[PDB]
Design a binder for this molecule. Structure first.
Ligand SMILES: O=C(O)COCc1ccccc1
Length: 171
């Protein structure tokens, strides 16, 4: 059976209970925590690519008021559907299963200034999603995998001082 497990789920949950935030910048910022998954039940003999995108979580934007996140407006038009290709792609099932798959180099931006960066809208909530794409497949069989534990609001600066502190503690 194909199984994709979130690594460091307890760490992600510490951020999620505060409401997680990720900085977006013109030139793009790496994530903390980093999304990492374990994988079993691929065909070790087959080749696959791992793609990461970010799904808009809500039909409204958010704002941090009196130390609480609350609905903050109607959403902006959706960011373009940017996909990050895991740099080990394409690779054998055996490669993906031998150790956890880390998306440590993906950068989140608020400027379409290129460079395999992911464009997000500030004060919108996103859910990371991984796709496993089988290589050489005339059916183009693909799996999708959502990580609710890893939901965050994109921000140009941290709103919650507890997030700023957690980011320093664990990073
Ligand atoms: O989904 C399965 O039963 C086989 O998993 C390997 C896989 C096949 C195609 C695309 C992604 C993963």
């Amino acid at each position: 059976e194909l199984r994709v497990g979130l690594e460091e789920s307890e760490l992600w949950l510490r951020f999620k209970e505060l409401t997680n935030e990720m900085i977006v910048t013109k030139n793009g910022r790496r994530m903390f925590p980093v999304l990492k998954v374990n994988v079993s039940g691929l065909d070790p003999n087959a080749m696959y690519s791992f793609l990461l995108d970010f799904v808009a979580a809500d039909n409204h934007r958010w704002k941090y008021v009196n130390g609480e996140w609350v609905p903050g407006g109607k959403p902006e038009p959706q960011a373009p559907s940017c996909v990050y290709i895991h740099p080990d792609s394409p690779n054998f099932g055996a490669h993906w299963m031998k150790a956890p798959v880390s998306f440590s180099k993906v950068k989140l931006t608020n400027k379409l200034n290129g460079g395999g960066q992911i464009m997000l809208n500030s004060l919108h909530k996103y859910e990371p999603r991984i796709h496993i794409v089988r290589v050489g497949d005339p059916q183009r069989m693909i799996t999708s995998h959502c990580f609710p534990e890893t939901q965050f609001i994109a921000v140009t600066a941290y709103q919650n001082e507890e997030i700023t502190a957690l980011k320093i503690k664990y990073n």
